[PDB]
């Protein structure tokens, strides 16, 4: 697998037309504040096709 | 007044746009910046571009990831506020900046 190529699987809101966003903050998937650490309902928003 | 900053968080974990006016030059730049808590003019880089008696007027608007600037200059008499009269601003630039915007600040 080649992991140089990434896609965002989670975001707070849909993009506006031609909106670009390189941010890498932890996505909060539920009730609990994630404070920049991975865990239950606290996910890295990028993935790779590999 | 010699510049502006625009963005969502304005600094840190998100992108933001900087403009600076520099005697004869103009500079425009976009990055995940970390500017001062109280910015100043006087004595990353995911987009970049380079080039009382008066009133300078401007409009800034963001549409479809482009950022549009219009402007006008005029002489004035009125000391208190914006003078009653009429002129229309004309387009300067239409920049493909792509970022989201929510907040701004003046540089002076
Ligand atoms: C743009 O940024 C603001 C402030 O963070 C946010 O509320 C809004 O959801 C964003 N808009 C889009 C289209 O992602
Ligand atoms: C600001 O303008 C001066 C005069 O043209 C120039 O020497 C300087 O390089 C400019 N600043 C930048 C960041 O280029």
UniProtKB/Swiss-Prot annotation, chain A:
Disulfide bonds: 34-42
Effect of residue 40 to V: In strain: Omicron/BA.4, Omicron/BA.5, Omicron/BQ.1.1
Chain intervals for the UniProt region annotation (Disordered): 9-44
Phenotype upon changing residue 44 to S: In strain: Lambda/C.37, Omicron/BQ.1.1, Omicron/XBB.1.5, Omicron/EG.5.1
Region ranges (Immunodominant HLA epitope recognized by the CD8+): 2-10
Subunit structure: Binds to host ACE2. RBD also interacts with the N-linked glycan on 'Asn-90' of ACE2. Cleavage of S generates a polybasic C-terminal sequence on S1 that binds to host Neuropilin-1 (NRP1) and Neuropilin-2 (NRP2) receptors. Interacts with host integrin alpha-5/beta-1 (ITGA5:ITGB1) and with ACE2 in complex with integrin alpha-5/beta-1 (ITGA5:ITGB1). May interact via cytoplasmic c-terminus with M protein. May interact (via N-terminus) with host bilirubin and biliverdin, thereby preventing antibody binding to the SARS-CoV-2 spike NTD via an allosteric mechanism.
Protein name, per record: Spike protein S1
Coverage span on the entire protein: 447 to 496 of 1273
